Paper text:
PCC 7120, one such strategy is the use of an ArsR-SmtB transcriptional regulator RexT that senses H2O2 and upregulates expression of thioredoxin to maintain cellular redox homeostasis. Different from many other members of the ArsR-SmtB family which bind metal ions, RexT has been proposed to use disulfide bond formation as a trigger to bind and release DNA. Here, we present high-resolution crystal structures of RexT in the reduced and H2O2-treated states. Each protomer of RexT has an α1-α2-α3-α4-β1-β2-α5a/b architecture.
To visualize the structural consequence of Cys residue oxidation, a 2.16-Å resolution structure of H2O2-treated RexT was solved (RexT_Ox). These crystals were prepared by removing crystals of reduced RexT from the anaerobic chamber and immersing them in a solution of cryoprotectant that contained H2O2. In chain A of the RexT dimer, a slight orientation difference is observed for both the Cys40 and Cys41 sidechains relative to the reduced structure. In contrast, in the α3 helix region of chain B, in agreement with the above-described biochemical results, the electron density is consistent with the presence of a disulfide bond between Cys40 and Cys41. Formation of this vicinal disulfide bond results in the creation of an eight-membered ring with the peptide backbone and distortion of the peptide bond geometry. Through this analysis, it was found that a cavity leads from the surface of the protein to a cluster of amino acids that includes Cys41. This cavity contains one molecule of H2O2 in chain A of the H2O2-treated structure and one molecule of glycerol in chain B of the reduced structure, suggesting the possibility that H2O2 gains access to Cys41 using this route. In the oxidized structure, the newly formed disulfide bond is oriented towards the protein surface and perhaps coupled with the architectural changes in RexT, more favorably interacts with reduced TrxA2 and permits subsequent resolving of the disulfide linkage.
Numbering used by the authors:
A (entry chain A): 0 to 102
B (entry chain B): 3 to 102
Amino acid sequence: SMRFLYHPDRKDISLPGVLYALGDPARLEIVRLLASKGEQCCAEFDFAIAKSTMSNHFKILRESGVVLTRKEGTQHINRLRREDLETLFPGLLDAVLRSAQPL
Amino acid sequence: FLYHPDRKDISLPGVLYALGDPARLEIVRLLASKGEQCCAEFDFAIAKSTMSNHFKILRESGVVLTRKEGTQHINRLRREDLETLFPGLLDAVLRSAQPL
Protein backbone atom coordinates (compact mmCIF):
# COMPACT_ATOMS: atom_id res chain seq x y z
CA SER A 1 0.00 0.00 0.00
CA MET A 2 0.99 3.69 -0.37
CA ARG A 3 -1.88 5.77 1.04
CA PHE A 4 -3.17 7.76 4.03
CA LEU A 5 -6.14 6.50 6.02
CA TYR A 6 -9.15 8.80 6.30
CA HIS A 7 -8.39 11.99 8.14
CA PRO A 8 -10.41 15.22 8.44
CA ASP A 9 -9.38 18.44 6.78
CA ARG A 10 -7.94 21.24 8.87
CA LYS A 11 -11.33 22.92 8.30
CA ASP A 12 -13.25 20.22 10.19
CA ILE A 13 -11.10 19.80 13.31
CA SER A 14 -12.80 21.16 16.42
CA LEU A 15 -11.27 22.02 19.77
CA PRO A 16 -13.79 19.86 21.70
CA GLY A 17 -13.10 16.98 19.36
CA VAL A 18 -9.37 17.23 19.94
CA LEU A 19 -9.75 17.47 23.70
CA TYR A 20 -12.10 14.50 23.71
CA ALA A 21 -9.49 12.56 21.74
CA LEU A 22 -6.78 13.49 24.26
CA GLY A 23 -9.23 12.88 27.15
CA ASP A 24 -8.09 9.31 27.90
CA PRO A 25 -4.92 7.93 29.54
CA ALA A 26 -4.26 5.52 26.67
CA ARG A 27 -4.85 8.09 23.92
CA LEU A 28 -2.95 10.79 25.79
CA GLU A 29 -0.06 8.32 26.11
CA ILE A 30 -0.25 7.54 22.38
CA VAL A 31 -0.01 11.22 21.57
CA ARG A 32 2.81 11.63 24.09
CA LEU A 33 4.77 8.82 22.42
CA LEU A 34 4.04 10.19 18.95
CA ALA A 35 5.21 13.65 20.00
CA SER A 36 8.50 12.38 21.47
CA LYS A 37 9.35 9.32 19.29
CA GLY A 38 7.92 10.49 15.95
CA GLU A 39 6.03 8.00 13.79
CA GLN A 40 5.05 4.70 15.45
CA CYS A 41 3.66 1.39 14.18
CA CYS A 42 0.12 0.60 15.51
CA ALA A 43 1.68 -2.44 17.29
CA GLU A 44 4.21 -0.19 19.04
CA PHE A 45 1.65 0.55 21.79
CA ASP A 46 1.31 -2.40 24.18
CA PHE A 47 -0.84 -1.13 27.05
CA ALA A 48 -2.62 -4.30 28.23
CA ILE A 49 -5.81 -3.17 26.48
CA ALA A 50 -8.45 -5.08 24.53
CA LYS A 51 -7.42 -4.78 20.86
CA SER A 52 -10.97 -3.53 20.04
CA THR A 53 -10.48 -0.67 22.55
CA MET A 54 -6.99 0.18 21.16
CA SER A 55 -8.53 0.12 17.67
CA ASN A 56 -11.23 2.51 18.87
CA HIS A 57 -8.52 4.69 20.43
CA PHE A 58 -6.66 5.14 17.15
CA LYS A 59 -9.91 5.63 15.25
CA ILE A 60 -10.81 8.44 17.64
CA LEU A 61 -7.34 9.94 17.31
CA ARG A 62 -7.65 9.78 13.52
CA GLU A 63 -11.22 11.03 13.22
CA SER A 64 -10.67 13.85 15.73
CA GLY A 65 -7.78 15.24 13.71
CA VAL A 66 -4.90 14.42 16.09
CA VAL A 67 -3.29 11.50 14.24
CA LEU A 68 -2.46 10.91 10.57
CA THR A 69 -2.33 7.16 9.95
CA ARG A 70 -0.56 5.74 6.91
CA LYS A 71 -0.90 2.22 5.52
CA GLU A 72 2.33 0.96 3.94
CA GLY A 73 2.39 -2.74 3.19
CA THR A 74 0.61 -4.76 5.88
CA GLN A 75 1.03 -2.42 8.84
CA HIS A 76 -0.40 0.98 9.79
CA ILE A 77 1.99 3.75 10.90
CA ASN A 78 0.78 6.67 13.00
CA ARG A 79 1.89 10.29 12.98
CA LEU A 80 0.99 13.38 15.00
CA ARG A 81 -0.71 16.11 12.98
CA ARG A 82 1.58 18.62 14.57
CA GLU A 83 1.30 21.39 12.00
CA ASP A 84 -2.48 21.12 11.78
CA LEU A 85 -2.89 21.25 15.55
CA GLU A 86 -0.39 24.09 16.00
CA THR A 87 -2.08 26.14 13.30
CA LEU A 88 -5.54 25.62 14.73
CA PHE A 89 -4.73 25.53 18.45
CA PRO A 90 -1.50 27.43 19.21
CA GLY A 91 0.11 26.19 22.39
CA LEU A 92 -2.45 23.44 23.05
CA LEU A 93 -0.20 20.49 22.17
CA ASP A 94 2.80 21.73 24.21
CA ALA A 95 0.49 22.66 27.10
CA VAL A 96 -1.02 19.16 27.10
CA LEU A 97 2.33 17.38 26.68
CA ARG A 98 4.07 19.46 29.43
CA SER A 99 1.33 18.35 31.86
CA ALA A 100 1.20 14.69 30.83
CA GLN A 101 2.67 11.99 33.06
CA PRO A 102 4.63 9.07 31.43
CA LEU A 103 2.17 6.16 31.47
CA PHE B 1 -19.80 22.93 48.52
CA LEU B 2 -21.16 20.20 46.31
CA TYR B 3 -19.09 17.08 45.70
CA HIS B 4 -15.58 17.82 44.46
CA PRO B 5 -12.41 15.69 44.38
CA ASP B 6 -9.26 16.60 46.26
CA ARG B 7 -6.46 18.11 44.17
CA LYS B 8 -4.64 14.73 44.49
CA ASP B 9 -7.37 12.99 42.46
CA ILE B 10 -7.57 15.43 39.53
CA SER B 11 -5.87 13.95 36.47
CA LEU B 12 -5.07 15.42 33.10
CA PRO B 13 -7.05 12.87 31.02
CA GLY B 14 -10.03 13.54 33.27
CA VAL B 15 -9.73 17.30 32.86
CA LEU B 16 -9.33 16.94 29.11
CA TYR B 17 -12.28 14.55 28.89
CA ALA B 18 -14.41 17.03 30.85
CA LEU B 19 -13.37 19.79 28.41
CA GLY B 20 -13.82 17.55 25.38
CA ASP B 21 -17.46 18.45 24.82
CA PRO B 22 -18.90 21.64 23.30
CA ALA B 23 -21.47 22.16 26.06
CA ARG B 24 -18.97 21.52 28.86
CA LEU B 25 -16.34 23.57 27.03
CA GLU B 26 -18.86 26.40 26.69
CA ILE B 27 -19.52 26.31 30.44
CA VAL B 28 -15.81 26.60 31.17
CA ARG B 29 -15.41 29.41 28.61
CA LEU B 30 -18.17 31.46 30.22
CA LEU B 31 -16.89 30.85 33.77
CA ALA B 32 -13.40 31.93 32.74
CA SER B 33 -14.39 35.35 31.38
CA LYS B 34 -17.55 36.29 33.32
CA GLY B 35 -16.42 34.69 36.65
CA GLU B 36 -18.53 32.88 39.32
CA GLN B 37 -21.84 32.33 37.50
CA CYS B 38 -24.99 30.97 39.09
CA CYS B 39 -28.24 30.15 37.51
CA ALA B 40 -29.30 29.33 33.93
CA GLU B 41 -26.68 31.36 32.04
CA PHE B 42 -26.04 27.92 30.42
CA ASP B 43 -29.31 27.71 28.47
CA PHE B 44 -28.56 25.24 25.60
CA ALA B 45 -30.88 22.89 23.63
CA ILE B 46 -30.01 20.03 26.04
CA ALA B 47 -32.02 17.73 28.28
CA LYS B 48 -32.05 18.91 31.90
CA SER B 49 -30.64 15.63 33.23
CA THR B 50 -27.96 15.78 30.54
CA MET B 51 -26.90 19.33 31.48
CA SER B 52 -26.85 18.07 35.07
CA ASN B 53 -24.54 15.22 34.05
CA HIS B 54 -22.38 17.82 32.28
CA PHE B 55 -21.96 19.73 35.53
CA LYS B 56 -21.38 16.50 37.44
CA ILE B 57 -18.65 15.61 34.94
CA LEU B 58 -17.13 19.07 35.32
CA ARG B 59 -17.18 18.70 39.12
CA GLU B 60 -15.93 15.09 39.26
CA SER B 61 -13.06 15.88 36.88
CA GLY B 62 -11.79 18.73 39.05
CA VAL B 63 -12.68 21.56 36.67
CA VAL B 64 -15.63 23.18 38.44
CA LEU B 65 -16.51 23.85 42.06
CA THR B 66 -20.20 24.26 42.86
CA ARG B 67 -21.81 25.67 45.99
CA LYS B 68 -25.49 26.05 46.80
CA GLU B 69 -26.73 29.55 47.70
CA GLY B 70 -30.46 29.48 48.32
CA THR B 71 -32.16 27.80 45.39
CA GLN B 72 -29.18 28.61 43.19
CA HIS B 73 -26.07 26.64 42.21
CA ILE B 74 -23.03 28.98 42.00
CA ASN B 75 -20.35 27.50 39.75
CA ARG B 76 -16.68 28.54 39.93
CA LEU B 77 -13.70 27.46 37.75
CA ARG B 78 -11.08 25.65 39.88
CA ARG B 79 -8.46 27.89 38.17
CA GLU B 80 -6.07 27.74 41.14
CA ASP B 81 -5.99 23.90 41.24
CA LEU B 82 -5.84 23.56 37.46
CA GLU B 83 -3.00 26.14 37.21
CA THR B 84 -1.25 24.39 40.10
CA LEU B 85 -1.42 21.00 38.39
CA PHE B 86 -1.47 21.90 34.68
CA PRO B 87 0.08 25.35 34.22
CA GLY B 88 -0.92 27.01 30.96
CA LEU B 89 -3.50 24.35 30.05
CA LEU B 90 -6.53 26.52 30.76
CA ASP B 91 -5.20 29.46 28.76
CA ALA B 92 -4.09 27.22 25.89
CA VAL B 93 -7.65 25.91 25.78
CA LEU B 94 -9.51 29.24 26.21
CA ARG B 95 -7.24 30.99 23.62
CA SER B 96 -8.81 28.81 20.90
CA ALA B 97 -12.29 28.31 22.37
CA GLN B 98 -15.08 29.73 20.26
CA PRO B 99 -18.66 30.46 21.49
CA LEU B 100 -20.97 27.58 20.69
